């Protein structure tokens, strides 16, 4: 059940891809650590909730 | 990969396309980038928004409560041989303000317990190491009347037995809400007053409040029988939301909190004085 | 097809047959029919005695009368049958014996009478007692035989310390054992409601923490009959109708034969 | 020596935990199981069994066999309710001690549909029609059949089938209600009325008992194990 | 094992 | 998957099929669902009965005993330099009531030991850390007469040596019953009185009781020789049934327990007063 | 001897099937933890112990 | 017994850590999610939403609705700045409390391009041309349009499209600037001037408000989570 | 070097063959735990040490 | 597997084979089982000598 | 450093337990077995041997 | 290993 | 590994 993922390596030693290993020890998912590999989304539903969405170089009002 | 978009090389313009002008009345924010109004070079962007993800923003254990409990000889007046705390993130302000950037949330909760103790009085001999019992009493269950009555038997309630000096105690709790999400805000009542009501107290409720006991209480006590000398202890509770999701953003609290609701009372003047034409 | 019904049954065991024209189907406790001890669940190694028809037939106990003040009746098994023909003889000649039972309770009246009997078969029916003294009910008192015992509406603590009765004090709404009667329905049961049915028929498997045990030391099943709704008729304030309990041992087998056990019931 | 680092939670004892531990009687020869009749796999199986309701908790009736008996009669006031009760299966005094009520007092949250079954224990010569009802929360609890009629209901006709069942369907705002009393998670109201009236002939009892029963429909579930207030012990 |  | 059955869409009815009517005399509970008596919509059900499984109901460690043992100078009168406890779930009420929803059970048992201590008297110097010995004495074995006699050699009996301040001690026990299941209730006697008996005491027994010693005892002592000053300790015992199976359900205890049997004495009035037509 | 099973994941992080690993360290099964993957059964033996079981839309008595 | 060696860090508690721990309510039946509208995946999404700037923090205007209103008029002194402000998005009193400013006060470092949008709230009969500008750090903060003209700027012409947007491009020496005030990581200066003037006809208001807005361009990011000075509590 | 064996499972949970894992950490066999999988033998060398062993249904003396 | 031998079903006897008689002078213990002197049923034995191993 | 969490039972001593431990005389040259007559594998073997009963415990 |  |  060992899960192996890659580290986003910031400062590199003078020595490529480095990994880390994870194993869940408990049956309940609430017991689990945070994976922190998170997906991002569009701001659109807040920044542009328009019914007719318009392209920025055209007149906003027409 | 998670890096932000690259800046494109952009040159001079003389055209009918006018990104710079817009109409905010629409309800929309203008999607502009530096290359729309100035000449830009090509930059290969490597920066990322890794640390401002919902999980990362909340991924820190915050102090939400300080419970004080004594261990001393049971006298016949009000003492603190045991204490109870209603579970909430609202007795403190910092995590409350962070959680409240959003209307609804959904998460698992991590509880870490830091226990410290000291001697109250100059001298009566000393104390052997104390074991503390932290019992969760969900709404409905018998609450303790006494530090060593039958409720502490804890046959079905979850309890933690903590030994002084050991690493801070830590447990995990699932998403336990009655709804599909936790409401950080509830514009309503738990009761409606009806025309046919006898007194008009029957239908009265607190504004914004949902259930009376929300999520129950933590009952804390020292399991040790009392030493000849008195020991006072504090149980500090750190809360961390994990595997978090949040909905419907809200403006941050701008004035000091005045209780569990959105009520304000004073220091309603958040902003500093600064001249209109002063840098 | 032809004309058959839920309400009309014939039960035949050995040289005995029961008919009923007003039944309410019939219950098989915990969905399990009586059966003999399987080789792979066997414990005493000596060859069993299976008396079959001589013991697995319907014995009818003494009749009890149900009247307006009747609080309830109880029986224990195998105890109610200790003196019943060759069944009782087999029970007392062997150290060990297992048996299932068909219990048939009988109570008819008329379309104008009224009342409802709660008939409950209870595994390990431990009853409560007389006293300040815990678990003190004497063997002879715990075992009424065919006669059965009764329920009371309230707890009368046998006060006489000096010369104790060592009797049970079974209170009706507490099922004689510290729990509420309304929940007795989790146990295998039927209701004899006089507007619906003459009788109840419950088939009991052998239930125990063991494949076989001592019948003289231990009762497996308790039969409790309580009036869920009191007897009533016309305007007559002193109505009385008979309740008759008929019971049959089933798949009976016995181990450990020796001289006969003669218990002291005085 | 494998390099290790002790995390928080270390050396604690959680009552609610699930870990291996040394066996104090190694190699013990265990007595095998035998197929005992009556095995239970889930506490909700017990809540699905019909048990009798203490419907009558009036001063002299309660903690007595009469608490199980509701009197119906041919001379009753037809405008009045036969019985009125709240849908609080673990809290309402009539429901809290039923087998369903008792399993629910070991849990904090309940959800699902319930069903009430009523038994006519009068004589065969007696007849009648009864309206039994359920009002979801939010309005005035029904005081007249006129009002009760408008909610979920069943019109029971007395006859050879002795009993009638009203299912109280799961109608809630929250996904799980609470087992304690609380206006925010309330279940509504149950009421009973005469639809016509009890009619008997002469030489027949004019009065009789009705017994009531409650059990869970197969969609019923519970969560958050907790201690019950239904038992305690002294110092 | 499960290597992402 | 373990979710409960979905609600089916159900429409109007005008028919000879009458689910609503029944006859409880049969001994059966009517299998009805909301769609049998009302119009229902289709609901895809996701709720489950995961937490009400037999294992989950019992999956909690409950307090069944508090053993007190002293460590002080051996004087010549009755002291508590060692103590003995008969193993049972009946000195406490909470787990007893849960276990008793059933007639027969079968399980492995987990024992967790919480040990706390304190100073009895205001002052005589102090105490170095104590080691406690918890010895199991199965029926038949020599019991201790003295806190340091030969029985504590424990050559064949299982013993736990616990050090004060260490994590609570924990051991596991197999299903150890003489029968195929543990009897939570025994409607019988261990002896029958015979007509030929000399006195009628020979055949007398306690009602409901099986063997005299049931499962033996736990003998507890402080292995340390006495300090100049006295230390009092309490060993709290938590019991958890695991890998559990249960048979033949029973109505829960409705009135306070009065000893090991089913006997009742007082508070025989469980139910509150409430009006017949009152919500 | 590592046993790998799936978690019934309730609250999900913004990141599918998650697993947990189990290994028994001791020879005696009594030493073992509780698996908590438990099978459910029919209420029938308690709710309907009838010899002739009848369908709910038909008369209980006939 | 696996031979182990305890390393430094053992038995500590780091607030910032990420570890598994026992679940105190095992096998709990969790309420499933439903698709609620308005879900947020990253705090930077909020900083990209235009929110109104408190541009007017003068003595009687601040902590009042007038703090949001800049007065433009046909009789203004054309040589003077309409408004002058520093590019310190989390620190400058006009910017620090905007939604962008507020998210930044929970972080130590910011980087990326910003954009200011101005709304003309005068009558339709009003006209004008406005120059809005940004001066990167290092010189004298602009006091005249002559000086402001020379830096990054936009000449806004009032008309049917009510609003204008000036993007402040990321021009910095350091890869990440600080959220507090600091000369070493300073952002420069923003200024506004009349390019021509507000012109109205007769029967028209000669004076009117301009509302201002700020939000982050899509290249904006933040780092080093920290506590905000924007909230506190008493003993 | 992980050794995997089966447990003789006595009380079974409501959930088949269950295993336990073993690894020796030390070079010296004396350091090792007890396997407790032990082979049984005939009582014959003590119960019947006869030169002419005879079948139980025949005369012991003849 | 380690369970003890099963009991065999054994019926009546009238024969020249006499397991019940023996001569302990030989130095030997008589190998008898319940089925040699009484009528026995078939029992599938599950008990074992696991805990009395050296 | 592998992140670990100490469970209950930790640092106890159970008389009835079965664990590995360091060998105090490493690499010792052990005397080999020889086939001694009379080996016992189970205490029940002894209970199967006929022994004489003290049938007469009178004064 | 044994993956269920 | 060595599975017996
Ligand atoms: C508005 C108030 O606060 C909240 O909405 C809010 C706050 C906290 C929260 O977390 C869940 C609260 C219930 C938990 C609290 C802690 N729990 C336990 C359980 C056992 C032990 C030993 N220790 N803690 C179990 C249940 C969920 C929501
Ligand atoms: C009616 C009374 O209670 C019970 O029926 C009931 C209660 C408990 C129970 O668990 C098993 C009891 C025997 C166990 C008790 C604890 N044991 C041990 C053994 C060694 C040590 C050090 N500590 N404890 C070994 C044997 C089994 C049944
Ligand atoms: C998947 O995990 C199979 C490989 C297992 C590798 C060894 C795991 C070491 C840790 C044991 C974890 C037991 C947790 C309860
Ligand atoms: C099956 O378990 C084979 C794989 C073993 C993986 C490593 C196990 C690590 C833990 C050692 C356990 C020793 C327990 C006595
Ligand atoms: C055989 O054992 C090969 C597999 C090894 C699995 C991991 C072992 C984990 C424990 C390390 C033991 C080191 C003992 C000195």
Nearest to C29 by CA among C207, C204, C248, C200: C204
- Report chain J residues whose CB lies below 8 A from the CB of C47: 9-10, 38-41
- The Cα B30–Cα B21 span in angstroms is 9
Q: Does B26 touch chain F (CB under 8 A)?
A: no
DSSP at H1: -
| Preceding omega of C256 cis (within 30 degrees of 0) | no
Which residues, including other chains, have CB under 8 Å from residue K14's CB and lie 6 or more apart?
A: D22, D24, F158, F159, F160, F161, F171
- For residue K4, the chain D residue with the least C-alpha distance is D6
Interface contact flag, G21 A25, Cβ < 8 Å:
yes
- The Cα H102–Cα H228 span in angstroms is 8
Instruction: Go through chain J and tell me how many residues it has.
Output: 54
In 3-state terms, what secondary structure has residue H210?
strand
Nearest to A38 by CA among B53, H222, B106: B53
Closest C-alpha residue for ligand 3 atom 14: A25
Q: What ligand is nearest to the CA atom of residue H3?
A: 5
Closest C-alpha residue for ligand 3 atom 3: A1
In 3-state terms, what secondary structure has residue I44?
helix
- The Cα F205–Cα C99 span in angstroms is 25
G29 to chain I, minimum CA–CA distance in Å?
A: 5
What is the token pair recorded at A44? 């659109």
Structural element, H or E, at residue C57: none
**CATH number of the structural domain spanning residue B259:** 2.60.120.20
Residue I27 zone, left/alpha/beta (φ > 0; ψ -120 to 50; rest)? alpha
In 3-state terms, what secondary structure has residue J27?
coil
CB F231 within 8 A of CB F130: yes
What is the token pair recorded at B159? 């309890």
Q: How far is CA H54 from CA F127, H62, H110, in A?
A: 68, 8, 21
- The Cα C228–Cα F22 span in angstroms is 18
Which residues, including other chains, have CB under 8 Å from residue C66's CB and lie 6 or more apart?
A: C107, C115, C117, C227, C231, C240, C241, C242, C243
Angle at C205 between CA C203 and CA C206, to 5 degrees: 140
Q: Find the CB nearest F232 among B154, B161, B225.
A: B225
- The Cα A22–Cα D24 span in angstroms is 33
Strand locations in G1-62 (E): 3-6, 19-22
Q: Does G40 touch chain D (CB under 8 A)?
A: yes
CB H123 within 8 A of CB H200: yes
CB D105 within 8 A of CB B142: no
DSSP at H226: -
Interface contact flag, I11 F107, Cβ < 8 Å:
yes
DSSP codes, chain K: -EEE-PPTTTT-EETT-------SSTT--PPPP---S---SBTHHHHTS----------
Nearest to C223 by CA among C197, C187, C181: C187
- The Cα D162–Cα C195 span in angstroms is 8
What is the token pair recorded at C42? 């066997």
Q: Look at the alpha carbons of D198, D200, D206, D209 in this order and tell me if their dihedral is positive or negative.
A: negative
What is the token pair recorded at C92? 């007392």
- For residue H20, the chain G residue with the least C-alpha distance is G20
What is the β-pairing status of strands E2-3 and A3-6?
Answer: parallel
- The Cα C81–Cα D150 span in angstroms is 57
Interface contact flag, G10 B244, Cβ < 8 Å:
no
Angle at B194 between CA B191 and CA B200, to 5 degrees: 80
DSSP codes, C132-168: SSTT---HHHH--GGG-EE-BSS------TTS----B
What is the token pair recorded at K10? 């930790």
Which residues, including other chains, have CB under 8 Å from residue C75's CB and lie 6 or more apart?
A: C61, C144, C148, C149, C222, C223, C245
Interface contact flag, D121 C182, Cβ < 8 Å:
no
- The Cα C230–Cα C245 span in angstroms is 19
Q: Rounded to a whole number, what is the largest CA-CA distance in chain D?
A: 96
Alpha carbon F223 to its chain centroid, in Å, reads 29
Alpha carbon F170 to its chain centroid, in Å, reads 17
Nearest to H208 by CA among H131, H143, H130: H130
What is the token pair recorded at H233? 């509590």
CATH of domain I1-62: 4.10.80.10
Total CB pairs under 8 A between chain F and I: 22
Which residues, including other chains, have CB under 8 Å from residue F15's CB and lie 6 or more apart?
A: none
Q: Does F176 touch chain C (CB under 8 A)?
A: no
What is the number of the ligand 5 atom nearest to the C-alpha of I2?
Answer: 2
- Report chain A residues whose CB lies below 8 A from the CB of E3: 3-5
Instruction: Give domain limits for chain G.
Output: 1-62
- For residue G33, the chain I residue with the least C-alpha distance is I13
Nearest to J37 by CA among J21, J22, J15, J20: J20
What is the β-pairing status of strands B182-183 and B62-71?
Answer: unpaired
F15 to chain C, minimum CA–CA distance in Å?
A: 22
Q: What ligand is nearest to the CA atom of residue B209?
A: 1
Q: List the domains of chain C with CATH numbers.
A: 1-266 (2.60.120.20)
DSSP codes, F74-96: --SS---SEEEEE--S-SSSHHH
Say if ligand 1 is within 6 A of residue B158 CB. yes
What is the β-pairing status of strands H207-216 and H70-73?
Answer: antiparallel
Say if ligand 5 is within 6 A of residue H40 CB. no
- For residue C38, the chain J residue with the least C-alpha distance is J43
Nearest to B80 by CA among B69, B90, B88: B69
Bridge partners of residue F163, in order along the sequence = F131
Instruction: Go through chain A and tell me how many residues it has.
Output: 62
Nearest to B106 by CA among B21, B182, B200: B182
Burial class (CB in 10 A: 0-12, 13-18, 19+), H227: middle
Contacts by residues C156-161 (CB-CB < 8 Å, ≥ 24 positions apart): C157/C130, C157/C131, C157/C132, C157/F265, C158/C130, C158/C131, C161/C132
Phi, psi for D46 (deg, rounded to 5): -70, -40
Nearest to D190 by CA among D129, D119, D118, D142: D142
Q: How far is CA F65 from CA C176, D22, F89, in A?
A: 29, 21, 8
- Report chain B residues whose CB lies below 8 A from the CB of A41: none
* K18-47 residues labelled b (16+ CB within 10 A) or e (exposed): bebeeeeeeeeeeeeeeeeeeeebbeebee
**Side-chain half-sphere of C142: how many Cα atoms within 13 Å?**
32
Count: domains in chain F: 1
Say if ligand 3 is within 6 A of residue G33 CB. no
Interface contact flag, B49 A40, Cβ < 8 Å:
yes
Phi, psi for F206 (deg, rounded to 5): -75, 130
DSSP at B6: P
CB D182 within 8 A of CB B212: yes
DSSP at H97: T
Structural element, H or E, at residue A21: strand A19-22
What is the number of the ligand 4 atom nearest to the C-alpha of G2?
Answer: 2
CB H169 within 8 A of CB B38: yes
| Alpha helices by DSSP H, chain D | 44-47, 99-104, 145-149
Angle at G43 between CA G38 and CA G48, to 5 degrees: 165
Total CB pairs under 8 A between chain H and I: 4
- For residue F138, the chain D residue with the least C-alpha distance is D25
- Report chain H residues whose CB lies below 8 A from the CB of G12: 33
CB B114 within 8 A of CB B239: no
Q: Does H58 touch chain B (CB under 8 A)?
A: yes
Sheet (strand H107-111) strand order: H177-178, H107-111, H221-225
Phi, psi for J26 (deg, rounded to 5): -55, -20
Q: How far is CA B242 from CA B216, F91, G11, H16, in A?
A: 20, 41, 9, 12
Numbered residues of chain J with Cβ closer than 8 Å to any chain K Cβ:
24, 29-30, 49, 52-54
What is the number of the ligand 2 atom nearest to the C-alpha of F135?
Answer: 22
Which residues form the domain of F206? 1-279
Q: Find the CB nearest D8 among H7, H13, H23.
A: H13
Instruction: Go through chain C and tell me how many residues it has.
Output: 266
Which residues form the domain of H202? 1-235
Technique behind the model: X-ray
What is the token pair recorded at K42? 């189970």
DSSP at L3: E
Closest C-alpha residue for ligand 5 atom 1: I1
F169 to chain H, minimum CA–CA distance in Å?
A: 17
DSSP at C171: B
Q: Look at the alpha carbons of G21, G25, G26, G32 in this order and tell me if their dihedral is positive or negative.
A: negative
Residue A42 zone, left/alpha/beta (φ > 0; ψ -120 to 50; rest)? beta
- Report chain D residues whose CB lies below 8 A from the CB of C192: none
DSSP at D39: E
Q: How far is CA F200 from CA D55, D178, H125, J30, in A?
A: 48, 57, 119, 42
Structural element, H or E, at residue B229: none
Instruction: Go through chain D and tell me how many residues it has.
Output: 235
What is the token pair recorded at H220? 């904006």
For chain B, the helix, strand and coil percentages under 3-state DSSP, each to the nearest 5: 10, 30, 60
Which residues, including other chains, have CB under 8 Å from residue F27's CB and lie 6 or more apart?
A: C24, C25, C27, C188, C189, C190, C191, C202, G49, G50
What is the β-pairing status of strands C199-204 and C27-28?
Answer: parallel
Question: Cα of I2 to ligand 5 centre, how many Å?
Answer: 7
- The Cα C209–Cα C217 span in angstroms is 14
What is the β-pairing status of strands H152-157 and H221-225?
Answer: unpaired
């Amino acid at each position: 059940g060992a899960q192996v993922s890659s580290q986003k390596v910031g400062a590199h030693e003078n020595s490529s891809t480095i990994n880390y290993t994870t194993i869940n020890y408990y049956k309940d998912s609430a017991s689990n650590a945070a994976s922190k590999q998170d997906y991002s989304q569009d701001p659109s539903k807040f920044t542009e909730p328009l019914k007719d969405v318009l392209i920025k170089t055209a007149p906003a009002l027409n | 990969q998670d890096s932000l978009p690259d800046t494109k090389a952009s040159g001079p313009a003389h055209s009918k396309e006018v990104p710079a002008l817009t109409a905010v009345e629409t309800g929309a924010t203008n999607p502009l980038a530096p290359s729309d109004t100035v000449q830009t070079r090509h930059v290969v962007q490597r920066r990322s928004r890794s640390e401002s993800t919902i999980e990362s923003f909340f991924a820190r254990g915050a102090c939400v409560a300080i419970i004080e409990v004594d261990n001393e000889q049971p006298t016949t007046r009000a003492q603190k041989l045991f204490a109870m705390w209603r579970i909430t993130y609202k007795d403190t302000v910092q995590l409350r303000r962070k959680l409240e950037f959003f209307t609804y949330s959904r998460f698992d909760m991590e509880f870490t317990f830091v226990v410290t103790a000291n001697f109250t009085n100059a001298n009566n001999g000393h104390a052997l190491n104390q074991v503390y019992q932290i019992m969760y009493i969900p709404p409905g269950a018998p609450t303790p009347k006494s530090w060593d009555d039958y409720t502490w038997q804890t046959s079905s309630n979850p309890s933690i037995f903590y030994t002084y000096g050991a690493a801070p105690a830590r447990i995990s709790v699932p998403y336990v809400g009655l709804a599909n999400a936790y409401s950080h805000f509830y514009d309503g009542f738990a009761k409606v007053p009806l025309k046919t009501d006898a007194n008009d107290q029957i239908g009265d409720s607190l504004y914004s409040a949902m259930t009376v006991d929300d999520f129950g209480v933590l009952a804390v006590r020292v399991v040790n029988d009392h030493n000849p000398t008195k020991v006072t202890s504090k149980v500090r509770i750190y809360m961390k939301p994990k595997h978090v999701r949040v909905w419907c953003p809200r403006p941050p609290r701008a004035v000091p909190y005045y209780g569990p609701g959105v009520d304000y009372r004073n220091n309603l003047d958040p902003l500093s004085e600064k001249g209109l034409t002063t840098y | 097809a032809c004309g058959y019904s839920d309400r009309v049954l014939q039960l035949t065991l050995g040289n005995s047959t029961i008919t009923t024209q007003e039944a309410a189907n019939s219950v098989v406790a915990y969905g399990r029919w009586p059966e003999f001890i399987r080789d792979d669940e066997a414990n005493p190694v000596d060859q069993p005695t299976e008396p079959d028809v001589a013991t697995c037939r319907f014995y009818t106990l003494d009749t009890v009368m149900w009247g307006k003040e009747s609080k309830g009746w109880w029986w224990k098994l195998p105890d109610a049958l200790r003196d019943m023909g060759l069944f009782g003889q087999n029970m007392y000649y062997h150290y060990l014996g297992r048996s299932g039972y068909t219990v048939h309770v009988q109570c008819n009246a008329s379309k104008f009478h009224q009342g409802a009997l709660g008939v409950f078969a209870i595994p390990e029916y431990c009853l409560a007692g007389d006293s300040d003294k815990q678990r003190y009910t004497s063997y002879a008192n715990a075992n009424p035989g065919e006669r059965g015992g009764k329920f009371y509406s309230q707890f009368n603590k046998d006060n006489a310390v000096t010369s104790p009765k060592r009797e049970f004090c079974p209170v009706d709404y507490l099922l004689g054992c510290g729990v509420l009667l309304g929940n007795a329905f989790v146990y295998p049961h039927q209701i004899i409601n006089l507007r619906t049915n003459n009788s109840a028929t419950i088939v009991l498997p052998y239930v125990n923490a063991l494949a076989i045990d001592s019948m003289v030391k231990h009762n497996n099943w308790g039969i409790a009959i309580l009036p869920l709704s009191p007897l009533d008729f016309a305007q007559d304030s002193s109505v009385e109708i008979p309740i008759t309990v008929t019971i049959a041992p089933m798949c009976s087998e016995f181990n450990g034969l020796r001289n006969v056990t003669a218990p002291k019931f005085q | 020596g494998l390099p290790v680092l002790n995390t928080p939670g270390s050396n604690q004892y959680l009552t609610s935990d699930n870990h291996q531990s040394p066996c104090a009687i190694p190699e013990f020869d265990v007595t095998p199981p035998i197929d005992i009749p009556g095995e239970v796999k889930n506490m909700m199986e017990l809540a699905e069994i019909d048990t009798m309701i203490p419907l009558n908790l009036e001063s002299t009736k309660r903690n007595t066999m009469d608490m199980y008996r509701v009197t119906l009669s041919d001379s009753a006031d037809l405008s009045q309710p036969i019985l009125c009760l709240s849908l609080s299966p673990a809290f309402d005094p009539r429901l809290s001690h039923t087998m369903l009520g008792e399993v629910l007092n070991y849990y904090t949250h309940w959800a699902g549909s319930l069903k009430f079954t009523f038994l006519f224990c009068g004589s065969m010569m007696a007849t009648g029609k009864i309206l039994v009802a359920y009002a979801p929360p939010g309005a005035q609890p029904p005081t007249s059949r006129k009002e009760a009629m408008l909610g979920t209901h069943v019109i029971w006709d007395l006859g050879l089938q002795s009993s009638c069942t009203m299912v109280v369907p799961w109608i809630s705002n929250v996904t799980y209600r609470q087992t304690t009393q609380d206006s925010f998670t309330e279940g509504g109201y149950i009421s009973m009325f005469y639809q016509t009236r009890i009619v008997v002939p002469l030489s027949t009892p004019k009065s009789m008992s009705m017994l009531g029963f409650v059990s869970a429909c197969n969609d019923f579930s519970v969560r958050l194990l907790r201690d019950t207030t239904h038992i305690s012990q002294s110092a | 094992i499960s290597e992402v």
